[PDB]
Amino acid sequence: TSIMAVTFKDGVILGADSRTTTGAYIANRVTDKLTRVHDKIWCCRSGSAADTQAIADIVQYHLELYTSQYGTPSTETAASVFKELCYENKDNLTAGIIVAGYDDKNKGEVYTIPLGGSVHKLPYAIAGSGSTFIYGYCDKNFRENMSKEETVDFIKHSLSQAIKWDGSSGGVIRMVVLTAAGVERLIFYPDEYEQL
Amino acid sequence: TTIVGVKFNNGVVIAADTRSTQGPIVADKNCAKLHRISPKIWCAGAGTAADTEAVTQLIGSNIELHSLYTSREPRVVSALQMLKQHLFKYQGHIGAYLIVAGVDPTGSHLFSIHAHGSTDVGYYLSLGSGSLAAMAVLESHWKQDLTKEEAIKLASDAIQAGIWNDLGSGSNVDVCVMEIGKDAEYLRNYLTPNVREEKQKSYKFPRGTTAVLKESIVNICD
Amino acid sequence: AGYDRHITIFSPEGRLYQVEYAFKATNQTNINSLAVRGKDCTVVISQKKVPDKLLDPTTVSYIFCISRTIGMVVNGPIPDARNAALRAKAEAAEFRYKYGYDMPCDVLAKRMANLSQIYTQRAYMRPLGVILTFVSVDEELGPSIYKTDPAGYYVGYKATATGPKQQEITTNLENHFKKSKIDHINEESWEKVVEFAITHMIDALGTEFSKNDLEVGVATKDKFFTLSAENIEERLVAIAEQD
Amino acid sequence: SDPSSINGGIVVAMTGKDCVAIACDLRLGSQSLGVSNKFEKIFHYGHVFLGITGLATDVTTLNEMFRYKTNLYKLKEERAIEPETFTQLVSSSLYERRFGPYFVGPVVAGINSKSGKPFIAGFDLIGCIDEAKDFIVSGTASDQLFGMCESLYEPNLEPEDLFETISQALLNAADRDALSGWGAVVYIIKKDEVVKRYLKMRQD
Amino acid sequence: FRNNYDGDTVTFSPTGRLFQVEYALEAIKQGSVTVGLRSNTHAVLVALKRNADELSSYQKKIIKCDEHMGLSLAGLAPDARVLSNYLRQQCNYSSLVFNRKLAVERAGHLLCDKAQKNTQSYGGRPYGVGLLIIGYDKSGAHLLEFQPSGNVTELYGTAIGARSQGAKTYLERTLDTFIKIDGNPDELIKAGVEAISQSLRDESLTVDNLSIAIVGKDTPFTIYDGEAVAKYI
Amino acid sequence: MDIILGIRVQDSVILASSKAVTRGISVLKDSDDKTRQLSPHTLMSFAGEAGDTVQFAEYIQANIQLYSIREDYELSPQAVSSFVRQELAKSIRSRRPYQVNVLIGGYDKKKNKPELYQIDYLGTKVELPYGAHGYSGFYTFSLLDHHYRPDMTTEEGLDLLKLCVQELEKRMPMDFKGVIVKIVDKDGIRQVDDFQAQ
Amino acid sequence: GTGYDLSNSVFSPDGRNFQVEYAVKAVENGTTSIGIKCNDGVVFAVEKLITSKLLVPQKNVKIQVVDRHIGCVYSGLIPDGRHLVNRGREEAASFKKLYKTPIPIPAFADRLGQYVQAHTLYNSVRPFGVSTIFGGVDKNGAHLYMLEPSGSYWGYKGAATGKGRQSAKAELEKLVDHHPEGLSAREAVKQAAKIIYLAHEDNKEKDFELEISWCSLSETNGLHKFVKGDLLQEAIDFAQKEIN
Amino acid sequence: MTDRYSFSLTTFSPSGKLGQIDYALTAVKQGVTSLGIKATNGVVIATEKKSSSPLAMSETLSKVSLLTPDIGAVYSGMGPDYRVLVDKSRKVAHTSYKRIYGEYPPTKLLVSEVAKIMQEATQSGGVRPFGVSLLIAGHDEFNGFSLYQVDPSGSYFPWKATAIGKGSVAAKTFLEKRWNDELELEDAIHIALLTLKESVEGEFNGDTIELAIIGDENPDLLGYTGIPTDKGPRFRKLTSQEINDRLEAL
Amino acid sequence: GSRRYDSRTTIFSPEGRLYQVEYALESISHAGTAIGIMASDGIVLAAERKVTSTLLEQDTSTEKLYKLNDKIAVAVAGLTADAEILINTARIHAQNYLKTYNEDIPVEILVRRLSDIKQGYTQHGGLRPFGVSFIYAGYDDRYGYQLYTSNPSGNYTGWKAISVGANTSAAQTLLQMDYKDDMKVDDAIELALKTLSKTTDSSALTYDRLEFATIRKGANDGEVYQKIFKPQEIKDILVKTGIT
């Protein structure tokens, strides 16, 4: 798996590959790893599919109940609920979640939650097995306040490299754009991104 | 075991082989692997046979009670959510692997479920020991906007790949077709390409062959 | 000849007085509400009354957003109303988590009616002194109005009304649906369905309304929302330029 | 090591024309040591017959369980349990102990009293129902029994012929297994009557 | 009225009263008098102990809670034992976990809350005892009055028990004098004994009748009985 | 392990049980009675894990005595054996199982028949003309297969036990220090006090 | 018949819960306390009846803080108020533990509401003998609330309860009319001192002590803080000048 | 909190009466009339749908409920009590029977479970009895067609035909005139409509009357094909139109 | 709290009687009479259905005579629903015994157990007692044919012939008159019917208002047989004895 989320001028973009393997066999080549927990709060999932699916569903439940009582939750609050579940059940979970969201006040935000259940607010985040190969690339190429098109290009170039080298990554590059305008689903096929 | 699911333009089909094994021995040459959750939601299971049957009837029972309580046709996402949360609770110890397919008021659906509680969604899926043989056929012939007839053909061909190439699969092909408008049609033994040939000899013994020590009538009545 | 009127056990006549007295509590607030179904929407109107000048008017509400799709208006005291509201929200969220789809209006109503039936049969729980009117645009049943009471009774409505002057609203609406021959307000936009509701509340109650005298909740496909005072004012201007 | 191998034993059931047979060996051992040659593994509740191979204590415990449960069934239903229904009871009872199971291989045989239809079934130790029209096999010589049944069997056999077939399936299978044998008993079951026959076999 | 609303602590009267709490308050009035007072350096408890016979001992009314805190009781002694035990544990918990001597103000809040739970739940009863807590913590000398209604009050001086109003009026007059008694323990005890004697009527303060306690700047909570209090009669 | 033998003859059940109690490198006792009377006509012998063996036997004894008082009636040997089997079967799936093997010799006064039951620690019950637990069976069963007859007198039974004990004393590695022998018949339970040199 | 006012959860024939109404009598008997919503915060004040010279001045604090941003004051049975605030604090901690953000005042108000309402549902508990005035500052502004023994609560511009509630409300209503554009925190503090003094004519027989707290975005950084020292005297002087 | 009512609210009076059961039966008497009639090849259960308002949609409230594919229930008395009894009855048919034996319970045994639930609300701590009498009609393979009444006490009785609620005394008398052991299902529907028409004051049509049968298997209602043994439910609720057909030739 | 509404079902009267047991016994005296009679070669159980109808399905009905075991049955007088609760537990107890000892449960042991359950509801729990009286008819190989009775107190006793329900005083006099120790089942069948016929509150004693059972040695077998009479068989035996 190769996943990332990048803040930019207008908000935030989540990116992911679509490959899930059991050993060397690709059990799913069109997986959707970009998961909605609220209107404009989404997450990228890595680790045990069972675990991250269960986590995300519980988080989505909490934020639905939060909204009913107290109105729209902040991205921080969503990250806090992920953290609470991951940290308190660290012995029985293998989950690496990136939480990304947009609200009008704070703009775009990215919180990464590694294996232990710690939380780290970052300008951008990368995770999944494929991410190791793009630490160098991303650190030399990321800039703050990029445009939507620049950010889409940064994610597309980054994940294409992660996919190129990581066997556990592949398929299509999915993105989810989060801004004041709303939510936009993007998808990029092998014939485009391999050529980069 | 080989099981597949294939979406088509107005519904979904699932299929399975009919071989049941205990290690390398064949117990049942015509096991029925297509289970019913509700009338229009069907299930094909692999892994620990007792677990697939148990978990399919439990959720089937709760889905019936839910349908009666809500006065609504059961949905495939409900079967999916209940199955996965049950399986996740038991951390893979319930060794059920399922392809669940069906139709309901929200449309037609096709999902896979694994023992630890993860789920996938797709237009074509396969599971079991014949998973890879079947998936090779699906990847070679699947296209979008399939007809009912093309889907049954494709799914049936995929099960055959398992039957012929996978030792864990064999015998017949069971199919069930679920179309948006109509009733689901369960096609038990849709194909029978493994009829055992007539034996060379009859082993009916002459009477008296077996030595008997003692004989008595058993009382059933009271 | 005494304690059968204090807890929920049968009187010699087979009655439950604590249930009957809980119905009485529903009218304590002296507020009337009504609900009507549109072509593809559902509208609830409730009177808003702010006696004390020291109150923040924006906090005085008997309409609740239970879920993204369901709304609930309560006739009865606010503490019990919010008790029912909080429970319904929790129930709505749990349903979606366990069963994978949004709790339907009628199913939530049945559930809350079942809970109410329990207080009617178990001694240690009192009935809530409230009548809950749930509304939505159900993905299967369309525009929906379902109402529950302290007896644990519930049913669907073409339209309904609740409060001290319930009967005046009810007969007014009955007479309209006899003339129009249909079981809903034949109008494409929800704004005109809100205007219908307010207009028929004015006729039935024989009283005019300002923008602060009303609360309005609207349900449409995939959302329930409440109107602001200014949204209502726009609506009250429309009815005046025609009356 | 294996709780299903400590005591030894086999059971086999076959369907015929308007009849069913079920047979078992009589051995009860502890590893190499043969202990009892009178250990019958077939029981019956009304007209439904249940064979049980595997760990002997569980064989006994399950017999007592199903007697207990079928007795209550008869009192409430005011009728004897039928084979199809009993098969579901056995299944659900076994699966109830999914993570601490009875180490057994049960086998149901009988004729439905209403339809007259011959019925057999087998189970794994956690209640997965093997339903077969021809035959069911269980125990330490199950490989051998599958071989013998697959070879010897044909459909629509008369009671007198089914007896010869099932007996010879059990005998020749038992003699290729150290932990099976030491006597055998065969139930021939028809709608009206049931005949029990003890077989003469090798005692080694 | 009253008759119908005094059966249990869970019932308000039509005027909003809690009669079971009020009856528990009455047990304190029947209890023997005890006085508390303080300056800026010390805090003193003085108690009039009661006996059953001339053959019996005098019921001790002062209980040490920690090295820097303690209290005197009037009413049901078994209830004082329970409440003093709780206070001993809370003082102890503060030391073990936080290495911190419990503030007398926080000790008051804890007693209030423990008494309150008995006044709102069914089946229980209020505590039938009143307590005067003295102590010296990080903000100096303190005296508290605890009533089983849950109300706790920080005072310069006070009294509880039968005829306690006499001592209370004395202290209310003497206020400006005894509050200035800094760095002199004996003189504060004198003022406490002159106060407790204001509530006398039946008898005089004898050697096994009087009980005194003191806590302060360089003084751990210490109880004086018998010949140790002979110099104050 | 400890020697536990049983034999049902015409009119009685005879139980023979070794006298040794050994822990590690030392024989602690050479006169141990590995038996409890459960009722006037029912005797149980036992062998297995150190503490479990007596604790189980006494617990069973207490229960059968309780039954006898409540009902003013002695349970049949068959009923007692079934109760014992059920208790053992419970313990095998419990936290810490009773590791005890037993023989139950009884005289059924209703049937006027002696009865011997062999039950192992798993709850494996079986009714036999003769029985052994542990390794002792590996010698005695074949010996008894040869010489046993069902119509034997009590005295012929005792001679047959002597033959079993002599074979064990010859071929078993352990010194089990002889046996205590008890006879169960219509008149109750008695001990053969002079088996050491009979 | 009769006897409907003996148990808590019981409806009278006219739909009332007499035990809650009797709890109100306990509140009406209590000391007067108020709340004043200003244009970026809230102010709380309370009357402390000085029974005797023996009460240490400035100790016996009645206003309580919840989390770091909420103030609570109440009239009636003081222990019941503390119990309620203890619950509030447990409840605010829980919210912060899960959601990270400090509990919003509306969210907090309902937490107290649901808890107080729960004590009108069963006969094995008695209702709370307090009306609680509380509030503070959150993500979107200042909030003032009053919570009755029934569990009923609303948002307020100004709130009053206790013995002198009619006097206070009358003064509160004059401020709402004469300062429509909004009052400041500085002003509200002085104005609160005035109202407690004017309300004290109901308890004029005995002496009293004034206590004030405030939570304001510009004056306290959105934290609850007590008013002490020169600012407290300035408010007392203002009230004494206004009384004459 | 805590249900501290751990004692019975139904007790014996000096005369031996169990007051709350009597009072529950009195509540049933005030309830709308319902009836059941057993034929040779089916059973019919019927009742009046008395709407509480013309603005209400009486289609959304069913007084006649499916419990299993071959078992249906109707009542007289308090509706909310009935609704929760149906929920519990449906569930207990699974947990206590179908999940054990893999088939639906026979009528007598499902009735027995419902009766047990009602008996317990007569003896358990802190509850009142159920204020309803149920009529349960059903079929199973070995018992054929059956009709049962269940009362607030938990008592139940098998009937050839009966009525309960408001005008049950008159209705029973009328059924005794018309019932025999050779009735066909359609004859029973007819007797049921005639009987029910004496109880209804106002409009008597397919919208105001509710009626269901236990009869032949309905393969068109099963929802799938392929399994010969599964032939569909025996319970069927008649439509508004189907009732009107039989009223025009009444 | 709750204390107010508690009837206190398990207390003594000043006379040392248990109120609820007495009032339950009063309830049972209105129930249809049930009679048990033991012969040398079997036991008869006869019972009267009180309140019937033409439409009551007798073929399917079973309100008084219940099977506990293949060797034990009971006749019921009182609340049927209450009886069925007790019936079911007795059936489980018999099966537990059988599973434990591999022998059918002796009759007294079953009766003692069931009567101990009744006694419990009498001494603790605060619940009403079961309004039931049982006649037990059974056979075992220790005491042969046995007849027992239990009532709501939990007291049980053994009998040669006995009645429960209504008119037991009259019925017991009639039985004591015409009973003798060397009777035969067929003579007992007649005695039981005659006795019911004289004590009935109805006009006549017809087949549709009766339940009837025998526990006989089966005539030709060697072991016990439980016969529960079908409506036609009761109609026949009613003619033989001379009551058409």
Swiss-Prot record, chain C:
Subcellular location: Cytoplasm; Nucleus
Alphabetized Pfam families for the sequence: Proteasome, Proteasome_A_N
Classification via SMART domains: Proteasome_A_N
GO cellular component terms, A-Z: mitochondrion; nucleus; proteasome complex; proteasome core complex, alpha-subunit complex
Cross-link (Glycyl lysine isopeptide (Lys-Gly) (interchain with G-Cter in ubiquitin)): 223
GO annotation terms (biological process): proteasomal ubiquitin-independent protein catabolic process; proteasome-mediated ubiquitin-dependent protein catabolic process
Keyword Zinc-finger among record annotations: no
Keyword Acetylation: yes
Keywords per UniProt: Acetylation, Cytoplasm, Isopeptide bond, Nucleus, Phosphoprotein, Proteasome, Ubl conjugation
Phosphoserine PTM sites in chain numbering: 228
UniProt superkingdom: Eukaryota
Further comment: Present with 15200 molecules/cell in log phase SD medium.
Similarity section: Belongs to the peptidase T1A family.
Function field: The proteasome degrades poly-ubiquitinated proteins in the cytoplasm and in the nucleus. It is essential for the regulated turnover of proteins and for the removal of misfolded proteins. The proteasome is a multicatalytic proteinase complex that is characterized by its ability to cleave peptides with Arg, Phe, Tyr, Leu, and Glu adjacent to the leaving group at neutral or slightly basic pH. It has an ATP-dependent proteolytic activity.
Protein name: Proteasome subunit alpha type-1
Organism from which the protein derives: Saccharomyces cerevisiae (strain ATCC 204508 / S288c)
UniProt lineage: Eukaryota, Fungi, Dikarya, Ascomycota, Saccharomycotina
UniProtKB/Swiss-Prot annotation, chain D:
Listed GO biological process terms: proteasomal ubiquitin-independent protein catabolic process; proteasome-mediated ubiquitin-dependent protein catabolic process
Major subcellular location class: cytoplasm
PROSITE patterns named among the record's database cross-references: PROTEASOME_BETA_1 (PS00854), PROTEASOME_BETA_2 (PS51476)
Source taxon at top rank: Eukaryota
GO molecular function: endopeptidase activator activity
GO CC annotation terms, alphabetical: cytosol; nucleus; proteasome complex; proteasome core complex, beta-subunit complex
Keywords annotated in UniProt: Cytoplasm, Isopeptide bond, Nucleus, Phosphoprotein, Proteasome, Ubl conjugation
Coiled-coil ranges per UniProt: none
Annotated positions of the Phosphoserine modification: 30
Entry annotated with the keyword Nucleus: yes
Covalent cross-link Glycyl lysine isopeptide (Lys-Gly) (interchain with G-Cter in ubiquitin) as placed by the record, residue numbers: 69
Localization, UniProt: Cytoplasm; Nucleus
InterPro entries documented for this protein: Ntn_hydrolases_N, Proteasome_beta_3, Proteasome_bsu_CS, Proteasome_sua/b, Proteasome_suB-type
Protein task: Non-catalytic component of the proteasome which degrades poly-ubiquitinated proteins in the cytoplasm and in the nucleus. It is essential for the regulated turnover of proteins and for the removal of misfolded proteins. The proteasome is a multicatalytic proteinase complex that is characterized by its ability to cleave peptides with Arg, Phe, Tyr, Leu, and Glu adjacent to the leaving group at neutral or slightly basic pH. It has an ATP-dependent proteolytic activity. This subunit may participate in the trypsin-like activity of the enzyme complex.
Family: Belongs to the peptidase T1B family.
Protein name: Proteasome subunit beta type-3
Organism of this sequence: Saccharomyces cerevisiae (strain ATCC 204508 / S288c) (Baker's yeast)
UniProtKB/Swiss-Prot annotation, chain E:
Keywords: Cytoplasm, Isopeptide bond, Nucleus, Phosphoprotein, Proteasome, Ubl conjugation
Gene Ontology terms describing biological process: proteasomal ubiquitin-independent protein catabolic process; proteasome-mediated ubiquitin-dependent protein catabolic process
Presence of the UniProt keyword Thylakoid in the record: no
Cross-link (Glycyl lysine isopeptide (Lys-Gly) (interchain with G-Cter in ubiquitin)), chain numbering: 190
InterPro entries: Ntn_hydrolases_N (IPR029055), Proteasome_alpha (IPR050115), Proteasome_alpha-type (IPR023332), Proteasome_asu_N (IPR000426), Proteasome_sua/b (IPR001353)
Compartment(s): Cytoplasm; Nucleus
Taxonomic superkingdom: Eukaryota
Gene Ontology CC: one annotated term: nucleus
PTM-bearing positions, type Phosphoserine: 13
Entry's family note: Belongs to the peptidase T1A family.
Record text on subunit structure and interactions: The 26S proteasome consists of a 20S proteasome core and two 19S regulatory subunits. The 20S proteasome core is composed of 28 subunits that are arranged in four stacked rings, resulting in a barrel-shaped structure. The two end rings are each formed by seven alpha subunits, and the two central rings are each formed by seven beta subunits. The catalytic chamber with the active sites is on the inside of the barrel.
Additional notes on this entry: Present with 7210 molecules/cell in log phase SD medium.
Protein name: Proteasome subunit alpha type-6
Organism: Saccharomyces cerevisiae (strain ATCC 204508 / S288c)
Encoding gene per record: PRE5
UniProtKB/Swiss-Prot annotation, chain F:
In-chain residues carrying the UniProt-annotated modification Phosphoserine: 76
UniProt-annotated location(s): Cytoplasm; Nucleus
Record flagged with keyword Phosphoprotein: yes
Residues recorded with modification N-acetylmethionine: 1
Recorded superkingdom: Eukaryota
Gene Ontology cellular component list: cytosol; endoplasmic reticulum membrane; nucleus; proteasome complex; proteasome core complex, beta-subunit complex
Sorted UniProt keywords: Acetylation, Cytoplasm, Nucleus, Phosphoprotein, Proteasome
Main localisation: cytoplasm
GO BP term (any one): proteasome-mediated ubiquitin-dependent protein catabolic process
A Pfam family this chain is assigned to: Proteasome
Any GO molecular function: endopeptidase activator activity
Assembly information from the UniProt record: The 26S proteasome consists of a 20S proteasome core and two 19S regulatory subunits. The 20S proteasome core is composed of 28 subunits that are arranged in four stacked rings, resulting in a barrel-shaped structure. The two end rings are each formed by seven alpha subunits, and the two central rings are each formed by seven beta subunits. The catalytic chamber with the active sites is on the inside of the barrel.
Family (UniProt): Belongs to the peptidase T1B family.
Additional record remark: Present with 21800 molecules/cell in log phase SD medium.
Annotated protein name in UniProt: Proteasome subunit beta type-4
Organism: Saccharomyces cerevisiae (strain ATCC 204508 / S288c) (Baker's yeast)
Gene designation: PRE1
